[PDB]
Protein backbone atom coordinates (compact mmCIF):
# COMPACT_ATOMS: atom_id res chain seq x y z
CA UNK A 1 0.00 0.00 0.00
CA UNK A 2 2.56 2.54 -1.19
CA UNK A 3 1.07 5.18 -3.47
CA UNK A 4 3.14 6.03 -6.56
CA UNK A 5 2.40 9.74 -6.07
CA UNK A 6 0.16 11.85 -3.84
CA UNK A 7 -2.73 11.90 -6.29
CA UNK A 8 -3.39 8.22 -5.60
CA UNK A 9 -3.83 8.75 -1.86
CA UNK A 10 -7.24 10.41 -2.26
CA UNK A 11 -10.30 9.37 -0.33
CA UNK A 12 -11.00 6.57 2.11
CA UNK A 13 -12.25 9.36 4.38
CA UNK A 14 -13.83 8.53 7.78
CA UNK A 15 -17.43 8.47 8.95
CA UNK A 16 -17.91 9.92 12.43
CA UNK A 17 -21.17 9.83 14.40
CA UNK A 18 -22.32 13.20 15.77
CA UNK A 19 -23.18 13.43 19.45
CA UNK A 20 -24.75 16.90 19.57
CA UNK A 21 -26.74 16.79 16.36
CA UNK A 22 -29.43 14.44 15.13
CA UNK A 23 -31.75 12.14 17.05
CA UNK A 24 -30.24 9.11 18.80
CA UNK A 25 -27.08 9.23 16.66
CA UNK A 26 -28.82 9.17 13.27
CA UNK A 27 -26.40 11.73 11.81
CA UNK A 28 -22.99 10.59 10.63
CA UNK A 29 -20.51 12.82 8.83
CA UNK A 30 -18.00 11.95 6.09
CA UNK A 31 -14.91 14.09 6.63
CA UNK A 32 -13.53 15.09 3.20
CA UNK A 33 -11.13 17.49 4.88
CA UNK A 34 -9.13 14.32 5.62
CA UNK A 35 -7.68 14.45 2.15
CA UNK A 36 -4.65 15.77 0.25
CA UNK A 37 -5.18 19.51 -0.27
CA UNK A 38 -7.77 19.32 2.60
CA UNK A 39 -10.99 18.99 0.62
CA UNK A 40 -13.25 16.79 -1.46
CA UNK A 41 -11.85 18.42 -4.61
CA UNK A 42 -8.70 16.30 -4.37
CA UNK A 43 -10.83 13.49 -5.81
CA UNK A 44 -11.97 15.36 -8.90
CA UNK A 45 -8.63 17.03 -9.36
CA UNK A 46 -7.03 13.61 -9.43
CA UNK A 47 -9.63 12.00 -11.69
CA UNK A 48 -9.98 14.81 -14.20
CA UNK A 49 -6.21 14.67 -14.74
CA UNK A 50 -6.19 10.86 -14.84
CA UNK A 51 -9.08 10.77 -17.31
CA UNK A 52 -7.47 13.39 -19.54
CA UNK A 53 -4.34 11.21 -19.57
CA UNK A 54 -6.28 8.07 -20.48
CA UNK A 55 -8.22 9.76 -23.27
CA UNK A 56 -5.16 11.50 -24.73
CA UNK A 57 -6.25 15.09 -24.11
CA UNK A 58 -3.45 15.54 -21.60
CA UNK A 59 0.00 14.37 -22.71
CA UNK A 60 3.54 14.93 -21.45
CA UNK A 61 4.34 18.54 -22.28
CA UNK A 62 0.81 19.99 -22.58
CA UNK A 63 -0.11 22.30 -19.70
CA UNK A 64 -3.17 22.69 -17.50
CA UNK A 65 -5.02 26.02 -17.36
CA UNK A 66 -7.96 27.05 -15.20
CA UNK A 67 -9.62 30.00 -13.52
CA UNK A 68 -10.28 28.52 -10.10
CA UNK A 69 -8.16 29.48 -7.13
CA UNK A 70 -10.62 27.81 -4.80
CA UNK A 71 -10.49 24.20 -3.61
CA UNK A 72 -10.47 22.86 -7.14
CA UNK A 73 -7.51 25.02 -8.17
CA UNK A 74 -5.61 23.93 -5.08
CA UNK A 75 -6.44 20.30 -5.91
CA UNK A 76 -5.33 20.67 -9.52
CA UNK A 77 -2.14 22.35 -8.32
CA UNK A 78 -1.25 19.42 -6.03
CA UNK A 79 -2.06 16.81 -8.69
CA UNK A 80 -0.08 18.75 -11.32
CA UNK A 81 2.94 18.89 -8.99
CA UNK A 82 2.54 15.21 -8.07
CA UNK A 83 2.30 14.09 -11.68
CA UNK A 84 4.69 16.51 -13.34
CA UNK A 85 2.46 18.94 -15.21
CA UNK A 86 2.80 22.64 -15.65
CA UNK A 87 -0.29 24.52 -14.54
CA UNK A 88 -1.42 28.13 -14.87
CA UNK A 89 -4.30 29.47 -12.80
CA UNK A 90 -5.88 32.83 -13.41
CA UNK A 91 -7.40 34.77 -10.54
CA UNK A 92 -8.45 38.30 -9.55
CA UNK A 93 -5.52 40.26 -8.13
CA UNK A 94 -7.70 40.85 -5.05
CA UNK A 95 -7.41 37.25 -3.87
CA UNK A 96 -5.60 36.82 -0.50
CA UNK A 97 -1.84 36.85 -0.23
CA UNK A 98 -2.12 33.55 1.60
CA UNK A 99 -3.98 31.89 -1.32
CA UNK A 100 -1.46 33.32 -3.78
CA UNK A 101 1.50 32.08 -1.75
CA UNK A 102 -0.12 28.66 -1.45
CA UNK A 103 -0.66 28.26 -5.19
CA UNK A 104 2.83 29.58 -5.99
CA UNK A 105 4.26 27.25 -3.37
CA UNK A 106 2.64 24.38 -5.27
CA UNK A 107 4.40 25.39 -8.48
CA UNK A 108 1.52 27.20 -10.16
CA UNK A 109 2.13 29.87 -12.78
CA UNK A 110 -0.28 32.40 -11.32
CA UNK A 111 -1.81 34.95 -13.66
CA UNK A 112 -3.48 37.83 -11.82
CA UNK A 113 -6.42 39.54 -13.45
CA UNK A 114 -7.99 42.98 -12.89
CA UNK A 115 -9.62 43.23 -9.48
CA UNK A 116 -12.52 45.17 -10.93
CA UNK A 117 -13.38 42.32 -13.33
CA UNK A 118 -13.61 39.66 -10.61
CA UNK A 119 -14.20 36.01 -11.56
CA UNK A 120 -15.52 37.10 -14.97
CA UNK A 121 -12.11 38.57 -15.71
CA UNK A 122 -10.17 35.52 -14.58
CA UNK A 123 -12.42 33.14 -16.51
CA UNK A 124 -12.13 35.21 -19.67
CA UNK A 125 -8.34 35.33 -19.28
CA UNK A 126 -8.08 31.55 -18.86
CA UNK A 127 -10.13 31.08 -22.05
CA UNK A 128 -7.84 33.61 -23.78
CA UNK A 129 -4.73 31.65 -22.81
CA UNK A 130 -6.14 28.34 -24.07
CA UNK A 131 -7.33 29.98 -27.34
CA UNK A 132 -3.77 31.23 -27.98
CA UNK A 133 -2.43 27.65 -28.33
CA UNK A 134 -5.32 25.12 -28.09
CA UNK A 135 -2.92 22.26 -28.74
CA UNK A 136 -0.76 23.24 -25.78
CA UNK A 137 -3.32 24.07 -23.09
CA UNK A 138 -6.05 22.00 -21.47
CA UNK A 139 -8.88 23.41 -19.35
CA UNK A 140 -10.58 20.58 -17.43
CA UNK A 141 -13.95 22.34 -16.82
CA UNK A 142 -15.09 21.09 -13.41
CA UNK A 143 -18.74 22.12 -13.84
CA UNK A 144 -19.24 19.88 -16.87
CA UNK A 145 -16.42 17.29 -16.96
CA UNK A 146 -17.98 13.86 -16.36
CA UNK A 147 -14.79 12.71 -14.62
CA UNK A 148 -16.02 14.82 -11.68
CA UNK A 149 -19.14 12.84 -10.75
CA UNK A 150 -17.47 9.64 -12.00
CA UNK A 151 -14.79 9.65 -9.31
CA UNK A 152 -17.54 10.06 -6.69
CA UNK A 153 -19.44 7.12 -8.18
CA UNK A 154 -16.28 4.99 -8.06
CA UNK A 155 -14.90 6.03 -4.66
CA UNK A 156 -16.92 8.34 -2.40
CA UNK A 157 -20.18 6.46 -2.93
CA UNK A 158 -18.76 2.96 -2.50
CA UNK A 159 -16.91 4.15 0.64
CA UNK A 160 -20.24 5.21 2.15
CA UNK A 161 -21.83 1.91 1.17
CA UNK A 162 -18.94 -0.06 2.68
CA UNK A 163 -18.54 1.89 5.91
CA UNK A 164 -22.30 1.74 6.65
CA UNK A 165 -22.60 -1.95 5.70
CA UNK A 166 -25.28 -0.82 3.26
CA UNK A 167 -27.38 0.81 5.96
CA UNK A 168 -27.18 4.40 4.66
CA UNK A 169 -30.72 5.73 4.08
CA UNK A 170 -30.11 9.40 3.35
CA UNK A 171 -27.21 11.33 1.85
CA UNK A 172 -26.99 15.08 2.41
CA UNK A 173 -24.55 17.14 0.34
CA UNK A 174 -24.08 20.79 -0.52
CA UNK A 175 -24.00 21.46 -4.27
CA UNK A 176 -21.20 23.42 -5.92
CA UNK A 177 -20.48 21.59 -9.19
CA UNK A 178 -22.98 18.90 -8.19
CA UNK A 179 -20.43 16.11 -8.69
CA UNK A 180 -20.52 14.80 -5.13
CA UNK A 181 -24.26 14.35 -4.80
CA UNK A 182 -24.53 13.07 -8.37
CA UNK A 183 -21.76 10.46 -8.18
CA UNK A 184 -22.64 9.29 -4.68
CA UNK A 185 -26.31 8.97 -5.54
CA UNK A 186 -25.62 7.06 -8.73
CA UNK A 187 -23.38 4.65 -6.85
CA UNK A 188 -25.79 3.89 -4.03
CA UNK A 189 -29.05 3.93 -6.02
CA UNK A 190 -27.90 2.43 -9.32
CA UNK A 191 -24.82 0.33 -8.55
CA UNK A 192 -25.87 -0.89 -5.09
CA UNK A 193 -29.63 -0.71 -5.68
CA UNK A 194 -30.76 1.02 -2.50
CA UNK A 195 -33.56 3.61 -2.87
CA UNK A 196 -32.08 6.21 -0.48
CA UNK A 197 -33.14 9.85 -0.16
CA UNK A 198 -30.62 12.17 -1.82
CA UNK A 199 -30.70 15.70 -0.42
CA UNK A 200 -29.05 18.64 -2.15
CA UNK A 201 -28.20 21.66 0.01
CA UNK A 202 -27.94 25.24 -1.23
CA UNK A 203 -27.87 28.74 0.28
CA UNK A 204 -31.26 30.28 1.00
CA UNK A 205 -29.61 33.39 -0.46
CA UNK A 206 -29.19 31.77 -3.88
CA UNK A 207 -31.73 28.91 -3.96
CA UNK A 208 -31.51 28.30 -7.70
CA UNK A 209 -32.17 24.54 -7.51
CA UNK A 210 -35.25 25.19 -5.36
CA UNK A 211 -36.43 27.96 -7.66
CA UNK A 212 -35.81 25.83 -10.76
CA UNK A 213 -37.65 22.76 -9.50
CA UNK A 214 -40.56 24.91 -8.31
CA UNK A 215 -40.77 26.62 -11.69
CA UNK A 216 -40.15 29.98 -10.06
CA UNK A 217 -38.05 32.79 -11.45
CA UNK A 218 -34.36 31.99 -10.98
CA UNK A 219 -32.78 34.66 -8.85
CA UNK A 220 -29.24 33.97 -7.74
CA UNK A 221 -27.79 36.13 -5.01
CA UNK A 222 -24.65 36.68 -2.90
CA UNK A 223 -23.89 34.48 0.06
CA UNK A 224 -21.00 33.44 2.26
CA UNK A 225 -21.18 29.64 2.11
CA UNK A 226 -18.00 29.20 0.06
CA UNK A 227 -17.91 26.09 -2.06
CA UNK A 228 -21.64 25.91 -2.86
CA UNK A 229 -24.36 28.04 -4.44
CA UNK A 230 -22.79 28.74 -7.85
CA UNK A 231 -25.95 30.56 -8.97
CA UNK A 232 -26.85 28.25 -11.86
CA UNK A 233 -27.58 24.56 -12.50
CA UNK A 234 -24.26 22.88 -13.44
CA UNK A 235 -24.17 20.09 -15.99
CA UNK A 236 -22.64 17.92 -13.27
CA UNK A 237 -25.75 18.18 -11.07
CA UNK A 238 -28.04 15.33 -12.06
CA UNK A 239 -31.38 16.79 -10.98
CA UNK A 240 -33.02 13.45 -11.80
CA UNK A 241 -31.40 11.75 -8.77
CA UNK A 242 -32.19 14.55 -6.30
CA UNK A 243 -35.15 13.74 -4.02
CA UNK A 244 -35.14 16.80 -1.83
CA UNK A 245 -33.54 20.24 -1.67
CA UNK A 246 -32.82 21.96 1.62
CA UNK A 247 -31.85 25.61 1.92
CA UNK A 248 -29.62 26.94 4.69
CA UNK A 249 -28.64 30.53 5.45
CA UNK A 250 -25.03 31.71 5.74
CA UNK A 251 -25.21 32.68 9.44
CA UNK A 252 -26.57 29.29 10.46
CA UNK A 253 -24.03 27.46 8.28
CA UNK A 254 -21.34 29.45 10.09
CA UNK A 255 -22.74 28.80 13.56
CA UNK A 256 -23.06 25.10 12.74
CA UNK A 257 -19.44 24.81 11.58
CA UNK A 258 -18.35 26.52 14.79
CA UNK A 259 -20.39 24.04 16.85
CA UNK A 260 -18.81 21.11 15.00
CA UNK A 261 -15.45 22.44 16.13
CA UNK A 262 -16.32 23.27 19.74
CA UNK A 263 -18.78 20.47 20.51
CA UNK A 264 -17.59 17.55 18.34
CA UNK A 265 -13.92 18.41 17.85
CA UNK A 266 -14.39 18.34 14.07
CA UNK A 267 -12.62 21.09 12.08
CA UNK A 268 -14.75 21.75 9.02
CA UNK A 269 -15.52 24.57 6.61
CA UNK A 270 -18.60 26.76 6.37
CA UNK A 271 -20.20 24.57 3.70
CA UNK A 272 -19.78 21.57 6.05
CA UNK A 273 -21.79 23.57 8.54
CA UNK A 274 -24.44 24.17 5.89
CA UNK A 275 -24.71 20.45 5.13
CA UNK A 276 -24.92 19.46 8.81
CA UNK A 277 -27.51 22.18 9.49
CA UNK A 278 -29.67 20.73 6.69
CA UNK A 279 -29.09 17.19 7.88
CA UNK A 280 -29.91 18.08 11.49
CA UNK A 281 -33.21 19.58 10.39
CA UNK A 282 -34.19 16.34 8.64
CA UNK A 283 -32.78 14.18 11.44
CA UNK A 284 -35.18 15.74 13.93
CA UNK A 285 -38.28 15.01 11.89
CA UNK A 286 -40.08 11.87 13.09
CA UNK A 287 -40.06 10.46 9.57
CA UNK A 288 -36.24 10.25 9.66
CA UNK A 289 -35.98 8.85 13.22
CA UNK A 290 -34.96 5.34 12.27
CA UNK A 291 -32.92 6.42 9.23
CA UNK A 292 -29.12 6.65 8.93
CA UNK A 293 -28.20 10.07 7.49
CA UNK A 294 -24.72 10.49 6.00
CA UNK A 295 -23.54 14.06 5.55
CA UNK A 296 -20.62 15.12 3.37
CA UNK A 297 -18.30 17.69 5.03
CA UNK A 298 -16.52 19.00 1.91
CA UNK A 299 -13.50 20.66 3.49
CA UNK A 300 -11.53 21.23 6.65
CA UNK A 301 -10.64 24.48 8.26
CA UNK A 302 -7.27 24.91 9.87
CA UNK A 303 -8.63 28.04 11.54
CA UNK A 304 -11.56 29.09 13.71
CA UNK A 305 -14.17 30.56 11.35
CA UNK A 306 -13.98 34.19 12.43
CA UNK A 307 -16.27 36.92 11.17
CA UNK A 308 -13.31 38.23 9.08
CA UNK A 309 -13.19 34.81 7.49
CA UNK A 310 -17.01 34.44 6.59
Amino acid sequence: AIYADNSYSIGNTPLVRLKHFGHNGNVVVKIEGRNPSYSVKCRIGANMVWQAEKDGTLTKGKEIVDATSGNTGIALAYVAAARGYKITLTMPETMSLERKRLLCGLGVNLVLTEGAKGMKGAIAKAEEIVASDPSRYVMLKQFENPANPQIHRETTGPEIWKDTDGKVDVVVAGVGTGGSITGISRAIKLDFGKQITSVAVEPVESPVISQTLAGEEVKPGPHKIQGIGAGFIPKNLDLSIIDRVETVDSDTALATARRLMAEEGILAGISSGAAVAAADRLAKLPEFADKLIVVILPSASERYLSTALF
Partner: peptide, 4 residues
Amino acid sequence: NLNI
Protein backbone atom coordinates in the same frame (compact mmCIF):
# COMPACT_ATOMS: atom_id res chain seq x y z
CA ASN B 1 -19.29 32.06 -6.33
CA LEU B 2 -17.78 30.20 -9.43
CA ASN B 3 -14.48 30.16 -7.61
CA ILE B 4 -15.12 26.78 -6.47
